[model samples]
Target: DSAAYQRTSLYGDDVVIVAAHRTPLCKSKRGNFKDTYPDDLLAPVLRALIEKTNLNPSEVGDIVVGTVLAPGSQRASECRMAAFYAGFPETVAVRTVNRQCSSGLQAVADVAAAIKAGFYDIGIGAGLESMTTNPKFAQAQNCLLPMGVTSENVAQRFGVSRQEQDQAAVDSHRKAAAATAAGKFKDEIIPVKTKLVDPKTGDEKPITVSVDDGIRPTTTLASLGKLKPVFKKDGTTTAGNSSQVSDGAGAVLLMKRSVAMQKGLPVLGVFRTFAAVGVDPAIMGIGPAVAIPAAVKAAGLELDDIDLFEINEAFASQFVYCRNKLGLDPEKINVNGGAMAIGHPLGATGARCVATLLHEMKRRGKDCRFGVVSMCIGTGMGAAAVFERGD
Candidate 1:
């Protein structure tokens, strides 16, 4: 009777994660983590997750990772390498995915799909990026384009203006600082131990990397208005309003709800639905415009029903564009800040956002039955996921 009863319940049969965590977002060149490798940065988070969840590394069925800027040393499926280095079972399968900003989110979606399809019972989805160590254009042999060239092209074609971009950036920082002060991020962050090596002094020391690096703790609209445009002579996109190139990693665990209950695991949330869509890459920042609606529909709900939303702030112009186009309430979106202030670690952003959103929903005591994580990807792709708070 117990087994049969469990089989019929929504909490017992679906896919769910018992735990999730992420390393603090670090400034790529200016912060204390400039010298760190992406793999090294991710290892501790993964290790801690296993320990905290009391999960046996050997029991994990697979490891799926999302990464971009794969060049010299980090090429060829770094996810598998990270898994092995972290001491997962040698027999466990590992794979890498690249969907630009949505890479990490896509990894989680794949994990859910696999479990729902009966391919595996336990898995981990991770995303990591090191913008400082990986040169963007170094791997290209024939075509040489300056970094942000494509972004510049998109801004010009879309007619995004500088004033609007600055306003968006200012708003992102303001929101992030307010959220941090409110302790909105306390539950999601897994404090990372970072070791710093000083070449000049020949000394090495370790410290905890706790807070987000990109937040302008002292930012104001007046300060943001003074910065010049970055990409074009009269462009709207500026360093102040754009996502910082940063390094970070995030990991989430997925297992059948039945297995979790049987093992007495503390379930955190349920994976409800996921969707990925394609759109014009030039206007890629408007990805949520398409993704949010699709994921809402897939979850059998409307946009207004979602209680929390995390839309990655790749660019201020695009964020505004998507917000306006999708008719999302600015108050309900990224209430705790976004990539514009917390830093965007490309592949890491998707998982990181989801982790943040779920934790915030639980913290606020909001009857947030549904939460959405969405981001625009490079090359005309967008990814989204719907999650429900676990009781």
Candidate 2:
């Protein structure tokens, strides 16, 4: 049933991204964003789109924020408040989407579809998560196999070794450290100004956070190997190999190419195709192995056609499994880094990956044309999206 039908024509109505931005990811409950409200974390990136592109905020038709953790209505209203803080007019409606880890990417997909349907000419697809404020509920994981248990299951079923997982973690940190040293994230990360509360003195101080706080430059395989597992007595899944619990937000501005052309805005990337698929609940980490091929096929491209990839490192076990299953080039995957080193703030990861991928593709020039942003969702699903360089 998964047939490829390549749409090669360049229509003026095609949806295209004009700007993408994100806040620096920080460790939850103890990092820069700990004292910042979720709405505050989201507003700066949202405001950056308008400021960077010089777009009229009133012209935007809607704002969709991908979020998880907070109560549904509460999150929705918080997103609405964020839109106002970003200076959007009251006429622009606001909403929230939740698909666990894929929520951010799903939000972007929804805005693209709406533009194609002629429902709107411009919109903002964004994501936000504040693990500090509304942490993941214990009952949520109790209902099924815990996330770490899923990682263990994937490692056992796919024959992923402890050494392999540790290696992946080391590589993630190494690449992330290199990218940071090279100043590669300057254009994508929006500086956030917030307050930090003193845990000991009960003092509050203002601070501007600009760099990712989770990247460990000194990480090594030997250092990771010494860490004990958290899920099982002898399990391979450890805190060092898994994604970090963090707080952050990201935003992407999309509109019809014709509109962008008229406004003299440079296109960052084109929205190509997206897919979501279900997998076994016990080994949910394997979701991307199936979903990536589906999205590529939908775009009439093969695995080889993808020039760069941002596959979320939810866990090294599943990340390694998917890479081995697809036979992907390690050099092309997470060239800058993955969630293991950058910190995965739940729903904010998708939009973060898009910003990261598109900016890197832009830096790589025309030789790098196609890119993918994908992630394994909680429960039993995976989501993937294809993108083409705007040039």
Candidate 3:
């Protein structure tokens, strides 16, 4: 692993990302994108990837979308429709994937493999979630465990106190607020031009959403402490400390390193390695604790070698436990905040994280090299991917 760290040479055959873009996340039922169609949410991001990189849509071999909540067939067709709205040629095929929360990251990893296998030279890995339009979880025997229940279980089993959870949420909002104020998200966020409908007047008004609407800069431990737990009467997990349900979309353009260089495109980051591991379903949030090490090792690097991380803050319990269990420095993880502040749009979270991580790494320049995007699944799994900053 240490040897791999020293060998930082770029390779022509490497699968590199040329552009990554995402729409601002908004509170699902009550935010800016509430009335926006799911396909519409995805289109601008796909369009941004092409426009930002000056790439021709016909050159894309495929556009893979990670989506949840909607029926599989319906979401697949919607994703294809999004491609058309983004100005993609009919020859550019599109599809959808679902792995619960990590579906977005899985889509990117899947595309990386296809490129590596000589299946295609260029592709777009994307994710979309319009919770306002998709609705909440449906009744199903297999998914009987509510996500909030999983959070409570993790907190009780891991001994993560309510104070810790509240503090994590506070830090999340603070960090996210700071980042937004600093214009740190400018590079990764693509403004979505849409309409905001007035519920009272029944009138629609044109609006362009560019900033995340979920981050509460005024959040504090004292404020969060006043909230009650939603999952259990005696549980530590509270709405104030959990990830917000949101609607958003993200896309990442990837190609062979040689292809990018041939087109005079700047390599944003190189897709290095990915791993997905399963854990007990009852405490699925603990998935990342096991998955991150596996991915770091697969990349021929140790945990200490990772320069940055974008771990999904699905719940404060799991987020705090994973950080402690992995012995990771708080400074290295979610430097610009996470789901707790930015909101988690399920399948869109992973793609959003990649855009956030890579863009932050680019700003940090040479000092920041290897980065990881990781998240726990809704069932009993975790997914992680390692990325190397392009030179």
Candidate 4:
């Protein structure tokens, strides 16, 4: 058979983010965010991102939200409710996703794929979680393994030690404190005003809840050393080293490069590649082991070429294992604090990590043309996204 030798690229699509913003991390049980609903927490973030970028709310084609725990009044398409509550046009389509810890990050990947596939432009990816409002074990069911039970099993299987876990926790706190002191997060964090509803007094009141809540201003190796492991008698995992339960929300505006150009919007970064992987549910924290390499290869780059990395601190043991396996430079990774110190609001973590990486890349001026964000999802899932800075 004879055919014309016409060549064309199968995939070469461009998507850019106009703006990204996240609310200040709220301490789960110890801060003002304790009373904030996931929907309410996300509403302001959506409004602010739209306002900051001067985006036409009516022009947003769809909204993608990530949330881990959906119960109480938050069920039934909470993402749609949040958009409308934030004053977005009713015509804007909205949907919610749950991928355990990677929920929010997965949302970004989904949006990127949709745009690359020429589906629609100008989408908003957001995530929210209020662990404080939804108490742990509140919805216990038969045949359901609790997170604590899983963590205990993982600890036994991995041979993680208490001292090692504490050391990791201390490192996380120190790193976050250093980042905060250096003002690395100033650009990404949008101070949020949290209102406390006095259930006892029947009063709605407003209060300022700026800055991350779980960051221990006085965290030290000595302080962390004195704490005992919580999961098991000889377990290595501890509350200090693991990500804190918290309430927060984050959103990023994604649009096709051509669409952005037409709107006269400046591109903050361009979506490059994404991948989702599945591992053994028992060792869930090892998710990035498969995801990182896959995403790096998909982006046509080597591991060493990645300028920055944001690997969510789901647990200290898993983080160390992944870092060692990937051969990533510790110095260039998580320059700011991570979930351990800053708090992880479940569904909001993925978007939060992206926002942090973008800000840090701009701050370091390390020719960081490429950045990778990854997280381990619950039940053996993992996700990763590669981003390129726009000149």
Candidate 5:
């Protein structure tokens, strides 16, 4: 009966992810990619997708990059120049998107939607961020503000405990480490060769960044407990438990199913459905709680029908809330490391999660046919995309 899970005959979506890859997520300011520009972080992944997939760069109709911190005009050019840097022709158009925390996922959704509508035969839904180079927020002149404040609000509102948060963080690191040891991440990551600066010592050197720097394989509750609360005096949220500020870029290539099959390319996964929902900015971390159900329902899926879940751990408080609120199987969530251990490069995280979910689903084999990628917004929203594994 376990083999009966994937009902591929029922769905009618024609958008499939043909190839996906991401650069190693580097810890912000202190990581290997601190000196790299956003476009510099993105170009190699695009180049890899083109060469690895044996796909002509000219055929890709457009590239949509999701970035949060960079100014739009600069990011837009970064997108255009990244395409050119990858040897793509000027005929290949480019645009940039900003959906707060979920920009990368949103970029994928936009490209998939367009392809489904026959607007493009091939597209790249990508994300890039060099947080150390880009100002996180020049000024939160209005309601759009720091995500840590929302984490604090969720902690106060949901009655989330520090112990649970610490445990979650520990689990995240352990899972990630286990996966890394198993070589589960080797397939999806594109090795990045670059110069790095040590934030502590200010020393500089050239190195190959192939592994995630944020994951502490030996991290423990005791080590995490030593982190003092920076957001609230009596709060549970700590820098150790929260997401690491990081620099990274990730990309997913979406092709029309017909086009992929025509090119003799195997579809790794299909974008079955997607949904984005708004929430109150004050309790923004809870966004995924609402967004997940909406996306599942929109895809005509019941909670029981899903096989795996990738809910971003921007903060453990909201992650815990969504996990409890949705009554998800803890074993089915993350299954690898999350933001707590891997770091979050703002706009890049959403697409990175997509790549993680699809690769894990494929690695999990047939039993994991359906997967979901969801994340909390910086202000007050959540985005969820339902995917089905492809042969």
Candidate 6:
């Protein structure tokens, strides 16, 4: 097991992720998990992970979760409760962070950095968003404008056209559909069986959501063209082409290489490096374009060396715009589709991409040595992370 360990993201032996999993991404309101609380979605993911990995709760030093909209400080407290609910004792502290879309991924980086700096040997990173409960919720920095308006600005200022976005949207759904049909998602998604409680009559109904529900297998560019602009009077962004409002959760388990080896835990991948940078709030969609090279360089590797890329599809306009501007090969990006097709659960999207990127590589065994996860944050920032495969 000593071939190479965590590497600790440009330091130490390493900060390696030994486990990753996610809850099914379902539609926000009318879809499956509307009645479930945000913490409810997260606790099970953590609980099942502990049980499956057989990792002792006492060994976990901390848990960090990202939530874009969790009502108030309740989300922060929820992070604590999720740990308790997942069987962790009070000795294991918890923290919740919100870096807009990069919240979850940031949690992972924070833990890795902390471990490298001698903070903790083991930790977990989680992300959650239930837009149905926190609809239109706003905070100081991200409250000025809706993301759709930002999308409109990106399209208008960047010269991204409606037709181009429509094409990208279709391709997203197509790829997501293909991946879903192949059962590729079965490896990571944990099926949830929850009761939907109705407030009006105090009625409850049981429902189980097992896969991403936003993808339209039959989607076509022509069908997307029929949709009208919802954000701007002369905008290219539309409901059909933008990220879906959905509810989902994801988690990654990290430990110092030495600890993982002592426990004999299988190494999924090691965090090579991560970067967070500010950008124009109006064109926040370009976050990945700027963040990618910064992270690749920080990892001491070039773009061509990375075998896979998971760029959050915050919007078709931005997805295409960022990828095009970065000059990345289309085939290397979002091979299983993206938020545009799978639903962007905001805070959860970043962590989900990290899990998905590595899982896809593991499945394809594409002989990939590295993978990158990048996202455009709300307001005007971008976050990117590089992973080195054990294979």
Cα TM-score of candidate 3: 0.93
Worst 10 residues of 1 by lDDT: 1-10
Worst 10 contiguous positions by lDDT, candidate 3: 1-10
Q: Is candidate 3 or candidate 5 better by TM-score?
A: 3
lDDT of 6 by residue, 325-356 (tens): 87788898899988889888878876788889
Better of 2 and 4 by lDDT: 2
Encode model 2's per-residue lDDT on 327-362: one tens digit a residue.
999999999988899897778888999999999999
lDDT of 4 by residue, 1-391 (tens): 0101111111244878778888888776656776776667788889987887777789887788877766644643566666877888778888777443344787777777687788887788888877554223343211013444454566557665556666667777888888788777778887776677776796779887767868886877687767677666876666676766677889988888998898788777877887777666546556666687877777888998899999877676666666766779987777777778888777788888888887776666648888988876563656778888765
* Number of clashing pairs per prediction, in order: 1, 0, 0, 0, 0, 5
Better of 3 and 4 by TM-score: 3
Between candidates 3 and 6, the lDDT winner: 3
Alpha carbon RMSD to native, model 2: 3.2
Q: Give the range of the ten consecutive residues with the poorest summed lDDT in model 5.
A: 1-10
Ten contiguous residues with the weakest lDDT in model 2: 1-10
Model 3 per-residue lDDT tens digits across residues 1-391? 1111111112233899999999999998589998888888899999988887788899999888888766657778778878999999789999787553444688888888888877899999999888555334562112324655775787798788999999999999999999999999999999889999988898999999999999999999899999998777888988889887788999999899889999999999999888777765445657678778878888888999999999988788888988988999999999999899989888887789999999999999998999999886564677788999977
Give RMSD to native, each candidate: 6.4, 3.2, 4.1, 5.8, 4.9, 5.0
**Clashing residue pairs in candidate 2, if any?**
none
Give each model a TM-score: 0.88, 0.93, 0.93, 0.88, 0.91, 0.91
Kindly provide the TM-score of model 1 when superposed on the true structure, using C-alpha atoms. 0.88
Off by over 4 Å in 2: 1-13, 100-103, 134-145, 280-283
lDDT of 2 at 283: 55
